[PDB]
Amino acid sequence: GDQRFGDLVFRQLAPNVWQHTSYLDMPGFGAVASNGLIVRDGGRVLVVDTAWTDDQTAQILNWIKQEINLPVALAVVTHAHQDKMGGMDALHAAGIATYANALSNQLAPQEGMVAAQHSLTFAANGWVEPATAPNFGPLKVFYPGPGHTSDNITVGIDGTDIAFGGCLIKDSKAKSLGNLGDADTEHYAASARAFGAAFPKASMIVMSHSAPDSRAAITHTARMADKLR
Numbered sequence: 758g759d760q761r762f763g764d765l766v767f768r769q770l771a772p773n774v775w776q777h778t779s780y781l782d783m784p785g786f787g788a789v790a791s792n793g794l795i796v797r798d799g800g801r802v803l804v805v806d807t808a809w810t811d812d813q814t815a816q817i818l819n820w821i822k823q824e825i826n827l828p829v830a831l832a833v834v835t836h837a838h839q840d841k842m843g844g845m846d847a848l849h850a851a852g853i854a855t856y857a858n859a860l861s862n863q864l865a866p867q868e869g870m871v872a873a874q875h876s877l878t879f880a881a882n883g884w885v886e887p888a889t890a891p892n893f894g895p896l897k898v899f900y901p902g903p904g905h906t907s908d909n910i911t912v913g914i915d916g917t918d919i920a921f922g923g924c925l926i927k928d929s930k931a932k933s934l935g936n937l938g939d940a941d942t943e944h945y946a947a948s949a950r951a952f953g954a955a956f957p958k959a960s961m962i963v964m965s966h967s968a969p970d971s972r973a974a975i976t977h978t979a980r981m982a983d984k985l986r
């Protein structure tokens with residue numbers, strides 16, 4: 758049930774939730790997929806993560822216009838890497854309010870990214886401070902601790918079986934944890950398990966670079982990270 762729209766792919770995961778997928782050719786290595794989410798919440802649409810580029814992210818907004826036909830109220834991006842924040846200009850051009858971890862926004866210029874318009878901050882237990890995430894509807898944002906990057910955050914979709922681990926979680930068939938260039942290998946395992954504990958009701962785990970998996974993806978990722986300590 759994958760729908761193609763331009764160079765992007767869209768898959769419905771639940772009555773009010775879709776996965777968006779965009780690709781970037783990396784020289785010598787080929788096209789890399791990156792996933793994010795689109796959530797219908799009453800009379801508005803919420804987006805998790807941009808596509809790799811501005812042009813691709815504009816196509817997400819175009820797809821939303823056609824298939825859902827409701828205004829995009831806000832977007833949350835899960836850390837300061839190109840696959841998650843590469844298309845920020847397309848959102849700001851459309852007047853969509855954007856949110857990121859304060860640390861992601863602090864890092865964005867160093868990473869060549871455009872910072873989100875707004876900053877999220879987090880309690881010592883990892884849950885977002887409600888004052889920084891107003892009107893997020895079903896999006897429950899959790900900072901699990903450093904892992905894939907120092908700033909990585911995760912999102913559960915309230916009222917569904919779905920939680921989004923971003924680039925922190927790999928699927929149960931994954932060989933490696935991928936890019937460890939920016940990673941915290943000491944705390945990764947604990948951060949992956951913290952994401953699992955934060956969303957115990959989630960049975961469908963969506964991640965950046967694999968099709969949705971079961972909760973086994975969290976545990977398998979944690980046990981791979983265990984060996985990096």
Ligand SMILES: C[C@@H](O)[C@@H](C(=O)O)[C@H]1C[C@H](SCCNC=N)C(C(=O)O)=N1
Nearest residue numbers: 789838839840841924934935936965966
């Ligand atoms: C380019 C960056 O956005 C990078 C990142 O988020 O750090 C992307 C691409 C690699 S894909 C490598 C996975 N390899 C699997 N065989 C990756 C990942 O492994 O999570 N994320």
Ligand SMILES: [Zn+2]
Nearest residue numbers: 836838905924
């Ligand atoms: Zn990343």
Ligand SMILES: [Zn+2]
Nearest residue numbers: 840924965966
């Ligand atoms: Zn990634």
